Amino acid sequence: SMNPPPPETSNPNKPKRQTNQLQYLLRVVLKTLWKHQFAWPFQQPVDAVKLNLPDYYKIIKTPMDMGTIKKRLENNYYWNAQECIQDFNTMFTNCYIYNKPGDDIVLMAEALEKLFLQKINELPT
Ligand SMILES: Cn1cc(-c2ccc(C(=O)Nc3cc(-c4ccccc4)ccc3N)nc2)c2cc[nH]c2c1=O
């Protein structure tokens, strides 16, 4: 297909372990962004077929979205908080390098990124 398989969200042989930062990433960061008015373009992988973006996966080499991030957190996929932060950053980068700077999608991404950074700056140690 035009669309890749979605990113893996299960880590079957990794031990399950909570950390304060991962709890924060799920219960504060992801929860706040997931419920935001502008979350909808970002809650699932970009469907280049339905959205008619035949070049999307030519430009975007590392697809990422909040649906994948949510599942990863809910499955304890990440070994540490920085991996999860990196996925958020990748999501936003993809949006900013593919879409035109004036597009409404970019304005929505910036509002979410602002909120993301606001929450990340209060990440527990
Ligand atoms: C990251 N990213 C994402 C999307 C994306 C992803 C999903 C949608 C989607 O679901 N639209 C939708 C919206 C409505 C709706 C919403 C609000 C009010 C009324 C109607 C209804 C149906 C559909 N289908 N749109 C754009 C996208 C496009 C171009 N570039 C990107 C991009 O980089």
Side-chain angles (χ1 to χ4, degrees), residues 1-30 32-34 36 38-49 51-60 62-85 87-99 101-102 104-106 108-125:
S1 176
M2 206 176 277
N3 294 317
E8 193 46 77
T9 59
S10 180
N11 209 340
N13 299 307
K14 164 186 177 294
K16 271 48 197 187
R17 193 161 91 61
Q18 271 298 9
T19 71
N20 294 111
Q21 297 194 333
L22 285 169
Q23 289 276 26
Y24 185 87
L25 276 164
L26 176 55
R27 299 181 61 99
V28 178
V29 181
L30 188 276
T32 301
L33 271 65
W34 188 260
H36 193 277
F38 297 163
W40 53 266
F42 307 101
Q43 285 175 307
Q44 61 288 306
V46 169
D47 186 337
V49 182
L51 295 163
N52 229 32
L53 312 170
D55 60 341
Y56 184 85
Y57 290 109
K58 295 167 190 193
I59 300 136
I60 296 310
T62 308
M64 188 49 54
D65 66 279
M66 290 204 305
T68 294
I69 294 169
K70 179 175 188 290
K71 289 175 179 180
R72 286 177 174 193
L73 284 165
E74 283 171 355
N75 298 338
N76 202 233
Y77 176 94
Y78 297 118
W79 292 88
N80 60 67
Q82 297 302 316
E83 296 188 299
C84 176
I85 291 165
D87 279 351
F88 276 106
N89 284 337
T90 294
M91 189 174 72
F92 293 124
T93 294
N94 291 347
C95 186
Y96 298 148
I97 72 180
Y98 180 79
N99 300 285
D104 290 316
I105 179 89
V106 171
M108 308 164 69
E110 301 167 347
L112 290 174
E113 188 186 21
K114 183 159 280 203
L115 187 51
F116 166 73
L117 295 170
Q118 289 175 358
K119 296 303 180 181
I120 281 314
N121 290 158
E122 310 173 329
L123 184 68
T125 48

PDB file of all heavy atoms in Angstrom, residues 40-42 44-47 51 53 56 64 91 94-96 98-99 105, ligand 1:
ATOM      1  N   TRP A  40      -7.146  15.975  16.681  1.00  0.00           N
ATOM      2  CA  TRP A  40      -7.625  14.987  15.714  1.00  0.00           C
ATOM      3  C   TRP A  40      -6.702  14.681  14.535  1.00  0.00           C
ATOM      4  O   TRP A  40      -6.691  13.513  14.107  1.00  0.00           O
ATOM      5  CB  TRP A  40      -9.073  15.259  15.278  1.00  0.00           C
ATOM      6  CG  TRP A  40      -9.317  16.638  14.778  1.00  0.00           C
ATOM      7  CD1 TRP A  40      -9.760  17.710  15.501  1.00  0.00           C
ATOM      8  CD2 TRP A  40      -9.130  17.107  13.438  1.00  0.00           C
ATOM      9  NE1 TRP A  40      -9.860  18.815  14.696  1.00  0.00           N
ATOM     10  CE2 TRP A  40      -9.472  18.475  13.425  1.00  0.00           C
ATOM     11  CE3 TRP A  40      -8.703  16.505  12.243  1.00  0.00           C
ATOM     12  CZ2 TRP A  40      -9.400  19.251  12.273  1.00  0.00           C
ATOM     13  CZ3 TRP A  40      -8.632  17.286  11.103  1.00  0.00           C
ATOM     14  CH2 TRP A  40      -8.980  18.639  11.127  1.00  0.00           C
ATOM     15  N   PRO A  41      -5.935  15.619  13.954  1.00  0.00           N
ATOM     16  CA  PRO A  41      -5.027  15.207  12.869  1.00  0.00           C
ATOM     17  C   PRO A  41      -3.929  14.287  13.336  1.00  0.00           C
ATOM     18  O   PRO A  41      -3.262  13.666  12.498  1.00  0.00           O
ATOM     19  CB  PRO A  41      -4.427  16.526  12.367  1.00  0.00           C
ATOM     20  CG  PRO A  41      -5.314  17.596  12.893  1.00  0.00           C
ATOM     21  CD  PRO A  41      -5.855  17.076  14.191  1.00  0.00           C
ATOM     22  N   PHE A  42      -3.717  14.190  14.648  1.00  0.00           N
ATOM     23  CA  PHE A  42      -2.537  13.575  15.225  1.00  0.00           C
ATOM     24  C   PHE A  42      -2.846  12.315  16.017  1.00  0.00           C
ATOM     25  O   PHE A  42      -1.927  11.734  16.600  1.00  0.00           O
ATOM     26  CB  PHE A  42      -1.797  14.596  16.103  1.00  0.00           C
ATOM     27  CG  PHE A  42      -1.506  15.887  15.383  1.00  0.00           C
ATOM     28  CD1 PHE A  42      -2.293  17.011  15.600  1.00  0.00           C
ATOM     29  CD2 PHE A  42      -0.477  15.961  14.448  1.00  0.00           C
ATOM     30  CE1 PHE A  42      -2.040  18.195  14.919  1.00  0.00           C
ATOM     31  CE2 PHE A  42      -0.224  17.135  13.772  1.00  0.00           C
ATOM     32  CZ  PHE A  42      -1.006  18.254  14.005  1.00  0.00           C
ATOM     33  N   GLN A  44      -3.853   9.347  15.002  1.00  0.00           N
ATOM     34  CA  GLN A  44      -3.691   8.092  14.280  1.00  0.00           C
ATOM     35  C   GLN A  44      -2.679   8.328  13.176  1.00  0.00           C
ATOM     36  O   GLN A  44      -2.438   9.476  12.795  1.00  0.00           O
ATOM     37  CB  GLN A  44      -5.028   7.627  13.675  1.00  0.00           C
ATOM     38  CG  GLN A  44      -5.631   8.601  12.672  1.00  0.00           C
ATOM     39  CD  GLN A  44      -6.186   9.861  13.321  1.00  0.00           C
ATOM     40  OE1 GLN A  44      -7.006   9.787  14.249  1.00  0.00           O
ATOM     41  NE2 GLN A  44      -5.733  11.027  12.846  1.00  0.00           N
ATOM     42  N   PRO A  45      -2.065   7.269  12.645  1.00  0.00           N
ATOM     43  CA  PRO A  45      -1.130   7.439  11.522  1.00  0.00           C
ATOM     44  C   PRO A  45      -1.772   8.196  10.365  1.00  0.00           C
ATOM     45  O   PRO A  45      -2.967   8.060  10.094  1.00  0.00           O
ATOM     46  CB  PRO A  45      -0.804   5.996  11.126  1.00  0.00           C
ATOM     47  CG  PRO A  45      -0.937   5.232  12.401  1.00  0.00           C
ATOM     48  CD  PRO A  45      -2.092   5.880  13.146  1.00  0.00           C
ATOM     49  N   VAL A  46      -0.956   8.993   9.675  1.00  0.00           N
ATOM     50  CA  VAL A  46      -1.417   9.677   8.475  1.00  0.00           C
ATOM     51  C   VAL A  46      -1.818   8.633   7.444  1.00  0.00           C
ATOM     52  O   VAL A  46      -1.019   7.765   7.072  1.00  0.00           O
ATOM     53  CB  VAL A  46      -0.315  10.598   7.940  1.00  0.00           C
ATOM     54  CG1 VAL A  46      -0.656  11.110   6.544  1.00  0.00           C
ATOM     55  CG2 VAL A  46      -0.069  11.744   8.909  1.00  0.00           C
ATOM     56  N   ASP A  47      -3.056   8.711   6.974  1.00  0.00           N
ATOM     57  CA  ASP A  47      -3.539   7.826   5.920  1.00  0.00           C
ATOM     58  C   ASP A  47      -3.324   8.562   4.604  1.00  0.00           C
ATOM     59  O   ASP A  47      -4.156   9.369   4.183  1.00  0.00           O
ATOM     60  CB  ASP A  47      -5.006   7.476   6.146  1.00  0.00           C
ATOM     61  CG  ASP A  47      -5.517   6.440   5.160  1.00  0.00           C
ATOM     62  OD1 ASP A  47      -4.932   6.313   4.068  1.00  0.00           O
ATOM     63  OD2 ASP A  47      -6.511   5.758   5.477  1.00  0.00           O
ATOM     64  N   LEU A  51      -6.198  10.636   2.578  1.00  0.00           N
ATOM     65  CA  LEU A  51      -5.902  12.062   2.590  1.00  0.00           C
ATOM     66  C   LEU A  51      -5.331  12.561   1.273  1.00  0.00           C
ATOM     67  O   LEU A  51      -5.137  13.773   1.124  1.00  0.00           O
ATOM     68  CB  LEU A  51      -4.942  12.413   3.733  1.00  0.00           C
ATOM     69  CG  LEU A  51      -5.447  12.205   5.164  1.00  0.00           C
ATOM     70  CD1 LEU A  51      -4.289  12.192   6.148  1.00  0.00           C
ATOM     71  CD2 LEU A  51      -6.455  13.268   5.552  1.00  0.00           C
ATOM     72  N   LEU A  53      -2.189  12.104  -0.136  1.00  0.00           N
ATOM     73  CA  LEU A  53      -0.831  12.616   0.041  1.00  0.00           C
ATOM     74  C   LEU A  53       0.157  11.570  -0.470  1.00  0.00           C
ATOM     75  O   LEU A  53       0.860  10.924   0.317  1.00  0.00           O
ATOM     76  CB  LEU A  53      -0.568  12.971   1.506  1.00  0.00           C
ATOM     77  CG  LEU A  53      -1.629  13.825   2.215  1.00  0.00           C
ATOM     78  CD1 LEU A  53      -1.362  13.901   3.714  1.00  0.00           C
ATOM     79  CD2 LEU A  53      -1.718  15.216   1.608  1.00  0.00           C
ATOM     80  N   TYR A  56       3.694  11.712   0.911  1.00  0.00           N
ATOM     81  CA  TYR A  56       3.903  11.891   2.345  1.00  0.00           C
ATOM     82  C   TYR A  56       4.995  10.967   2.855  1.00  0.00           C
ATOM     83  O   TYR A  56       5.925  11.398   3.550  1.00  0.00           O
ATOM     84  CB  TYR A  56       2.609  11.650   3.126  1.00  0.00           C
ATOM     85  CG  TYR A  56       2.808  11.922   4.598  1.00  0.00           C
ATOM     86  CD1 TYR A  56       2.684  13.211   5.102  1.00  0.00           C
ATOM     87  CD2 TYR A  56       3.160  10.902   5.479  1.00  0.00           C
ATOM     88  CE1 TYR A  56       2.894  13.482   6.434  1.00  0.00           C
ATOM     89  CE2 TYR A  56       3.360  11.160   6.822  1.00  0.00           C
ATOM     90  CZ  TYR A  56       3.229  12.449   7.290  1.00  0.00           C
ATOM     91  OH  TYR A  56       3.434  12.711   8.616  1.00  0.00           O
ATOM     92  N   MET A  64       5.126   9.062  12.842  1.00  0.00           N
ATOM     93  CA  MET A  64       4.765   8.984  14.250  1.00  0.00           C
ATOM     94  C   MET A  64       3.480   9.765  14.486  1.00  0.00           C
ATOM     95  O   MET A  64       3.207  10.757  13.806  1.00  0.00           O
ATOM     96  CB  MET A  64       5.882   9.523  15.151  1.00  0.00           C
ATOM     97  CG  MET A  64       5.672   9.294  16.651  1.00  0.00           C
ATOM     98  SD  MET A  64       5.210   7.596  17.149  1.00  0.00           S
ATOM     99  CE  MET A  64       6.530   6.657  16.388  1.00  0.00           C
ATOM    100  N   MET A  91       6.829  13.376  15.738  1.00  0.00           N
ATOM    101  CA  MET A  91       5.506  13.755  15.256  1.00  0.00           C
ATOM    102  C   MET A  91       5.463  15.209  14.809  1.00  0.00           C
ATOM    103  O   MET A  91       4.976  15.521  13.717  1.00  0.00           O
ATOM    104  CB  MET A  91       4.501  13.620  16.392  1.00  0.00           C
ATOM    105  CG  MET A  91       3.065  13.776  15.902  1.00  0.00           C
ATOM    106  SD  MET A  91       1.857  13.450  17.154  1.00  0.00           S
ATOM    107  CE  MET A  91       2.099  14.899  18.156  1.00  0.00           C
ATOM    108  N   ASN A  94       7.645  15.943  11.716  1.00  0.00           N
ATOM    109  CA  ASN A  94       7.045  15.467  10.475  1.00  0.00           C
ATOM    110  C   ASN A  94       6.065  16.492   9.938  1.00  0.00           C
ATOM    111  O   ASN A  94       6.059  16.808   8.744  1.00  0.00           O
ATOM    112  CB  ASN A  94       6.316  14.144  10.713  1.00  0.00           C
ATOM    113  CG  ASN A  94       7.253  12.997  11.006  1.00  0.00           C
ATOM    114  OD1 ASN A  94       8.460  13.100  10.808  1.00  0.00           O
ATOM    115  ND2 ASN A  94       6.699  11.890  11.483  1.00  0.00           N
ATOM    116  N   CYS A  95       5.225  17.021  10.824  1.00  0.00           N
ATOM    117  CA  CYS A  95       4.229  17.992  10.407  1.00  0.00           C
ATOM    118  C   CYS A  95       4.882  19.245   9.835  1.00  0.00           C
ATOM    119  O   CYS A  95       4.439  19.773   8.806  1.00  0.00           O
ATOM    120  CB  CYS A  95       3.353  18.330  11.610  1.00  0.00           C
ATOM    121  SG  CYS A  95       1.965  19.392  11.214  1.00  0.00           S
ATOM    122  N   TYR A  96       5.945  19.723  10.483  1.00  0.00           N
ATOM    123  CA  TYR A  96       6.563  20.985  10.085  1.00  0.00           C
ATOM    124  C   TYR A  96       7.412  20.858   8.827  1.00  0.00           C
ATOM    125  O   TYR A  96       7.640  21.856   8.134  1.00  0.00           O
ATOM    126  CB  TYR A  96       7.453  21.513  11.206  1.00  0.00           C
ATOM    127  CG  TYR A  96       6.728  21.816  12.489  1.00  0.00           C
ATOM    128  CD1 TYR A  96       7.367  21.659  13.707  1.00  0.00           C
ATOM    129  CD2 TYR A  96       5.412  22.251  12.487  1.00  0.00           C
ATOM    130  CE1 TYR A  96       6.727  21.918  14.887  1.00  0.00           C
ATOM    131  CE2 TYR A  96       4.759  22.522  13.664  1.00  0.00           C
ATOM    132  CZ  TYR A  96       5.420  22.361  14.862  1.00  0.00           C
ATOM    133  OH  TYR A  96       4.751  22.634  16.036  1.00  0.00           O
ATOM    134  N   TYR A  98       6.721  18.621   6.282  1.00  0.00           N
ATOM    135  CA  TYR A  98       5.872  18.218   5.164  1.00  0.00           C
ATOM    136  C   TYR A  98       4.883  19.300   4.742  1.00  0.00           C
ATOM    137  O   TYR A  98       4.741  19.579   3.547  1.00  0.00           O
ATOM    138  CB  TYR A  98       5.102  16.929   5.481  1.00  0.00           C
ATOM    139  CG  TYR A  98       4.234  16.513   4.315  1.00  0.00           C
ATOM    140  CD1 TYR A  98       4.785  15.866   3.221  1.00  0.00           C
ATOM    141  CD2 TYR A  98       2.875  16.814   4.284  1.00  0.00           C
ATOM    142  CE1 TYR A  98       4.010  15.515   2.133  1.00  0.00           C
ATOM    143  CE2 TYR A  98       2.089  16.462   3.199  1.00  0.00           C
ATOM    144  CZ  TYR A  98       2.667  15.810   2.127  1.00  0.00           C
ATOM    145  OH  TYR A  98       1.898  15.451   1.041  1.00  0.00           O
ATOM    146  N   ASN A  99       4.175  19.894   5.697  1.00  0.00           N
ATOM    147  CA  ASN A  99       3.113  20.844   5.400  1.00  0.00           C
ATOM    148  C   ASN A  99       3.665  22.255   5.223  1.00  0.00           C
ATOM    149  O   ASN A  99       4.715  22.618   5.759  1.00  0.00           O
ATOM    150  CB  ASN A  99       2.069  20.823   6.513  1.00  0.00           C
ATOM    151  CG  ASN A  99       1.429  19.466   6.673  1.00  0.00           C
ATOM    152  OD1 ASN A  99       0.602  19.067   5.856  1.00  0.00           O
ATOM    153  ND2 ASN A  99       1.835  18.732   7.708  1.00  0.00           N
ATOM    154  N   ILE A 105      -3.012  22.999   9.677  1.00  0.00           N
ATOM    155  CA  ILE A 105      -2.465  21.830  10.365  1.00  0.00           C
ATOM    156  C   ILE A 105      -1.220  22.202  11.163  1.00  0.00           C
ATOM    157  O   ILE A 105      -0.979  21.675  12.257  1.00  0.00           O
ATOM    158  CB  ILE A 105      -2.183  20.705   9.353  1.00  0.00           C
ATOM    159  CG1 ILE A 105      -1.587  19.491  10.051  1.00  0.00           C
ATOM    160  CG2 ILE A 105      -1.230  21.175   8.269  1.00  0.00           C
ATOM    161  CD1 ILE A 105      -2.588  18.560  10.525  1.00  0.00           C
TER     162      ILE A 105
HETATM  163  C1  LIG B   1      -0.244  14.911  10.673  1.00  0.00           C
HETATM  164  N1  LIG B   1      -1.132  15.256   9.565  1.00  0.00           N
HETATM  165  C2  LIG B   1      -2.454  14.908   9.619  1.00  0.00           C
HETATM  166  C3  LIG B   1      -3.341  15.196   8.633  1.00  0.00           C
HETATM  167  C4  LIG B   1      -4.764  14.796   8.771  1.00  0.00           C
HETATM  168  C5  LIG B   1      -5.122  13.645   9.466  1.00  0.00           C
HETATM  169  C6  LIG B   1      -6.456  13.324   9.650  1.00  0.00           C
HETATM  170  C7  LIG B   1      -7.414  14.180   9.116  1.00  0.00           C
HETATM  171  C8  LIG B   1      -8.874  13.875   9.314  1.00  0.00           C
HETATM  172  O1  LIG B   1      -9.244  12.921   9.994  1.00  0.00           O
HETATM  173  N2  LIG B   1      -9.710  14.791   8.779  1.00  0.00           N
HETATM  174  C9  LIG B   1     -11.105  14.879   9.004  1.00  0.00           C
HETATM  175  C10 LIG B   1     -11.589  15.983   9.697  1.00  0.00           C
HETATM  176  C11 LIG B   1     -12.962  16.134   9.904  1.00  0.00           C
HETATM  177  C12 LIG B   1     -13.472  17.328  10.618  1.00  0.00           C
HETATM  178  C13 LIG B   1     -12.695  17.954  11.593  1.00  0.00           C
HETATM  179  C14 LIG B   1     -13.135  19.111  12.211  1.00  0.00           C
HETATM  180  C15 LIG B   1     -14.360  19.654  11.882  1.00  0.00           C
HETATM  181  C16 LIG B   1     -15.146  19.041  10.927  1.00  0.00           C
HETATM  182  C17 LIG B   1     -14.709  17.887  10.299  1.00  0.00           C
HETATM  183  C18 LIG B   1     -13.822  15.155   9.408  1.00  0.00           C
HETATM  184  C19 LIG B   1     -13.336  14.059   8.723  1.00  0.00           C
HETATM  185  C20 LIG B   1     -11.966  13.892   8.504  1.00  0.00           C
HETATM  186  N3  LIG B   1     -11.478  12.805   7.805  1.00  0.00           N
HETATM  187  N4  LIG B   1      -7.097  15.294   8.432  1.00  0.00           N
HETATM  188  C21 LIG B   1      -5.795  15.581   8.269  1.00  0.00           C
HETATM  189  C22 LIG B   1      -2.827  15.923   7.490  1.00  0.00           C
HETATM  190  C23 LIG B   1      -3.433  16.432   6.307  1.00  0.00           C
HETATM  191  C24 LIG B   1      -2.458  17.085   5.607  1.00  0.00           C
HETATM  192  N5  LIG B   1      -1.282  17.003   6.299  1.00  0.00           N
HETATM  193  C25 LIG B   1      -1.478  16.298   7.463  1.00  0.00           C
HETATM  194  C26 LIG B   1      -0.570  15.968   8.497  1.00  0.00           C
HETATM  195  O2  LIG B   1       0.621  16.258   8.511  1.00  0.00           O
END
